[PDB]
Amino acid sequence: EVKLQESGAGLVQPSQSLSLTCSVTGYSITSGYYWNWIRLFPGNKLEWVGYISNVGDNNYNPSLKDRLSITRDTSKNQFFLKLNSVTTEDTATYYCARSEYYSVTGYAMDYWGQGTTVTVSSAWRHP
Amino acid sequence: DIELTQTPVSLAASLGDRVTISCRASQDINNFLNWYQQKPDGTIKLLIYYTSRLHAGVPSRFSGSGSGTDYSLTISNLEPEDIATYFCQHHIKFPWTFGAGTKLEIK
Amino acid sequence: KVEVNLAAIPLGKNVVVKWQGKPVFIRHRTPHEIQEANSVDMSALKDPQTDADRVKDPQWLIMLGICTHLGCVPIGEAGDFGGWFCPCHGSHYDISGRIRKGPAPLNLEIPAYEFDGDKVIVG
Ligand code: FES
Numbered sequence A: 001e002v003k004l005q006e007s008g009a010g011l012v013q014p015s016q017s018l019s020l021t022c023s024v025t026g027y028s029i030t031s032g033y034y035w036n037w038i039r040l041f042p043g044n045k046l047e048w049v050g051y052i053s054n055v056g057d058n059n060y061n062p063s064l065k066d067r068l069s070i071t072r073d074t075s076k077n078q079f080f081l082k083l084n085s086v087t088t089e090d091t092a093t094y095y096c097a098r099s100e101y102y103s104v105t106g107y108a109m110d111y112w113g114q115g116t117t118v119t120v121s122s123a124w125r126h127p
Numbered sequence B: 001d002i003e004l005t006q007t008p009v010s011l012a013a014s015l016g017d018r019v020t021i022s023c024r025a026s027q028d029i030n031n032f033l034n035w036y037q038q039k040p041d042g043t044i045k046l047l048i049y050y051t052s053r054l055h056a057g058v059p060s061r062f063s064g065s066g067s068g069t070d071y072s073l074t075i076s077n078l079e080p081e082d083i084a085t086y087f088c089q090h091h092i093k094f095p096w097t098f099g100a101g102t103k104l105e106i107k
Numbered sequence C: 001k002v003e004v005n006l007a008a009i010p011l012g013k014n015v016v017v018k019w020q021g022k023p024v025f026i027r028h029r030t031p032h033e034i035q036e037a038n039s040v041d042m043s044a045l046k047d048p049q050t051d052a053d054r055v056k057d058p059q060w061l062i063m064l065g066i067c068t069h070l071g072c073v074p075i076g077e078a079g080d081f082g083g084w085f086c087p088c089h090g091s092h093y094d095i096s097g098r099i100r101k102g103p104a105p106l107n108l109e110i111p112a113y114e115f116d117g118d119k120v121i122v123g
Helices: C031-038
Strands: A003-008 A018-025 A034-040 A046-053 A058-060 A071-073 A078-083 A092-102 A106-112 A116-120 B004-007 B019-025 B033-038 B044-049 B070-075 B085-090 C002-005 C014-019 C022-028 C060-064 C084-086 C091-093 C099-101 C113-116 C119-122
Touching: A003 A092, A003 A106, A003 A116, A018 A034, A018 A092, A018 A116, A034 A078, A046 A078, A046 A092, A046 B085, A078 A092, A106 B033, A106 B044, B004 B085, B019 B085, B070 B085, C002 C014, C002 C022, C060 C119
Parallel strands: none
Antiparallel strands: A003 A018, A018 A078, A034 A046, A034 A092, A046 A058, A071 A078, A092 A106, A092 A116, B004 B019, B019 B070, B033 B044, B033 B085, C002 C119, C014 C022, C022 C060, C084 C091, C091 C099, C113 C119
C-alpha cells in the first residue's frame, strides 16, 4: 500500500516563503506517475497547484507559476512545495497527491495526503 | 481556462434515498471527469474517474454518467456515512480545475 | 487480425483467443486489481514496467499468453501474485502480467491493438 504523510510549518508570516514536505512510503517517486500539490480554500474551492513527474519535469498552474517551486529528494523519497511571498490569499489546507495516467482514461489522483492546514498570520509562533 | 459548476449547491436528503449531483464545464471535455469525496474530518478520496469508472473500494451504489459538458453522480442510499463534500475535476488540458463543491447533509 | 467483443466479457473473467497461432490473454480487471497493479514499486521487478506502460485502458489487460522463459502458456488465476502461473518451470506473473518470480526474464509481451467501441482489434 502507498502512503503520503505531509509535514511542515502550519503558520507563516506574510511576504515569507511557505514550505511543505510530502513523504511517500510504499512506492518510489522515481518509479512512475505524477506527484501533485493542491490547496483547499475556506470558501470550498479546490485549486490545482502543480506537479513533478518521476523524471523530474515540472508543470505549474499559470495562476501561481511565477512563485512556487516543486522539488524532490529521491534519497528520502519526498517532494516539496515552496510558495514564495505569501499573502492572506494563500491561507488554505494544502494536499499532496499522486495521479496516474492511462492513455485512454487520462489522469486521476488516487493517493492523497493527510492535509496540512496553513495560515498566513502576522502572529508569532514558537519554532 | 475551463470552469465547472456543481449544482445543486449543498443540498440535503434523508437517511437512505437516491440523489443526483452534476458538473457543467465552460468548454467541452470528452469524458475526462473525476469525482472526489472530502470527508468532514478532512480526508479526501477518489470515487470516480473518466466519468463512469469506479475506483478501488468505492461501493456499488455509486454511479456516474454524462458526456460533452453535462455530468452526473448518482447514489442508491446514503446509509450511513455518505455525508461529505463532493468535488469534480477535468483533465483534458492544464490546468485542472475543480467544481464549486456540493455538501451533503442529513435532516 | 482478430476482433474480440469486449462487451461479451464479464467482470473478473479471463478470455483466451487465437491470433497467429499464439494465445492472446484478455482480462476485464476489477477496480481492486487495477490498484494492485499500479501500486507496485519498480525495485521489486526484474523487468521494470508501470501498469500504464503496459495497458491503454486500465480495465482491459491485453497480452500474449506466452511465457517468456520457454514458451508454455501460463495458467490464469494462479500463482503467488494474483495473476498467472506457468506450470512448466514455475514462473509467477502479477495482475499486470509482469514477471515476479521464476526463470522467465521478461513480462508477458503486449501486442499491438486499437479500440473501437465495444470491440478491440488485436493485430
Ligand atoms: S516456460 Fe514458463 S517457466 Fe519455463
